[PDB]
Write a protein that binds this ligand. Structure first.
Ligand SMILES: CC(C)(C)c1onc(OCP(=O)(O)O)c1C[C@H](N)C(=O)O
Ligand SMILES: CC(C)(C)c1onc(OCP(=O)(O)O)c1C[C@H](N)C(=O)O
Lengths: 257, 257
């Protein structure tokens, strides 16, 4: 039985309302739960869904050099495969293997409905509406390094802004938008932006195109015997239209706005 | 010296106007020419850009089961790496290796400006404005195999439409749009649609969102000692913002509309 590590994140993996009366994999529902089933079916293996211990995605401590989250669970041998909204990055690709992207995304802008902002440019040219990002992560690093006037301009602003425009968690950014009465815009991964826009109280919306492009990939350890098959299954699923069908299902068909 | 196989296609690889006075790699310019330079730099190797003999990207003959194009060059050991707008697909991934995608794309709709069509659904509900695709390839196949009502209806229309709505080449499809006075819409890869839209006579435009999602990747023979390194380089370049810089450079900065 293959040990799958994943993370409780909506709408990827969530516990059913009546989960206490259910067993094993049947306790969970979500985009990645359906995806795992598809992958396992096409690859031909039985599996067990396990929630990542520390509830993290995967980063290496610059001091201890220890990997946390799902990535850590793979390199230290606790799980055989990770099926989650795990962004494919250079540092992670150096210690584990990623299938080709099963979902595309990018940095996007979240505003409280009514806010007079339609793009990253609109934000850069004004200050009445504050805007920020997580105090760490690829989004912050993106602006921090962007040599693009519109983005670097936004960076200088964000850094010299008072009070701080940075938040520690995603939930904090989203709440700051909903409670700032239109005076705060939040930069985050488009997938989450699009998802929140379809959830009550339906008071936020995504605007403008994405600022960059990345993808989520299924991960397996170097040399894994699952690596190749998994990659081919992801491609097959996308080509059969299943990936788009699952996106629509969990984001819109189950939407509330 | 690394032997790179590529193909002359705008704005990826093109012979400079004064190419006869230039030599080797210097004869060419474009997105893939710059990308090739960047990859080689980071990976630290010397290379030679060679143009695929048959002018094909990579398809397996159903009868002989022989691969043509750049895929063929890699599969049969004629080239070390392919740097071009080569779509990552299941059938290709089974015979060669692909780096993570360096560019995203999808099937899109090209219309001559003024055409009263905003989406694929719009096209599917009528026949006044004819629409088609290449007489062969993944776009045609996408429609042939789609389970989506709108797309399946579009397929049935295209297959039975007279005169034939299919074209032999990309240039023919675009030309047909431009000379049909808005009575012909062409379905093609978004990247080409967005490029042409920025080119005189500025009489075409992309409408609606893409119908699917895929990407171009750098390819190497299965088990190539270059594969790993090149893949890591692509991720690094995307993280450094170089891939977007190049896209903006060849599509928009050098724009004419
Ligand atoms: C998956 C979800 C949408 C919840 C997510 O939203 N923001 C994230 O990270 C912050 P940043 O994008 O700044 O690194 C992540 C997690 C990210 N995809 C990862 O793989 O670490
Ligand atoms: C890259 C470019 C935009 C020139 C292109 O436009 N149409 C193409 O194929 C036809 P289809 O998409 O029908 O397979 C390709 C080539 C394609 N990316 C491939 O890898 O074969």
């Amino acid at each position: 039985t293959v040990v799958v590590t994943t993370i409780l994140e909506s709408p990827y993996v969530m516990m059913k309302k009546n989960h206490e009366m259910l067993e094993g994999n049947e306790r969970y529902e979500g985009y990645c739960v359906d995806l795992a089933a598809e992958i396992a079916k096409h690859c031909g293996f039985k599996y067990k869904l396990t929630i990542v211990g520390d509830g993290k995605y995967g980063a290496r401590d610059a001091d201890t050099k220890i990997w946390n989250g799902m990535v850590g669970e793979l390199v230290y041998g606790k799980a055989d495969i990770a099926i989650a909204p795990l962004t494919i990055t250079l540092v992670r690709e150096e210690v584990i293997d990623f299938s080709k992207p099963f979902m595309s995304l990018g940095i996007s802008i979240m505003i409280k409905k009514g806010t007079p902002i339609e793009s990253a440019e609109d934000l850069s040219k004004q200050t009445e509406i504050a805007y920020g990002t997580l105090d760490s992560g690829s989004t912050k690093e993106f602006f921090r390094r962007s040599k693009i006037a519109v983005f670097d301009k936004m960076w200088t602003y964000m850094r010299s802004a008072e009070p701080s425009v940075f938040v520690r968690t995603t939930a904090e950014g989203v709440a700051r938008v909903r409670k700032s009465k239109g005076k705060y815009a939040y930069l985050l991964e488009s997938t989450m932006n699009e998802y929140i826009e379809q959830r009550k109280p339906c008071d936020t919306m995504k605007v403008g195109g994405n600022l960059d492009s990345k993808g989520y990939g299924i991960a397996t350890p170097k040399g894994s015997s699952l690596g190749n098959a998994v990659n081919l299954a992801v491609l097959k699923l996308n080509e059969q239209g299943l990936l788009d069908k699952l996106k629509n299902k969990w984001w819109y068909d189950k939407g509330e706005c």
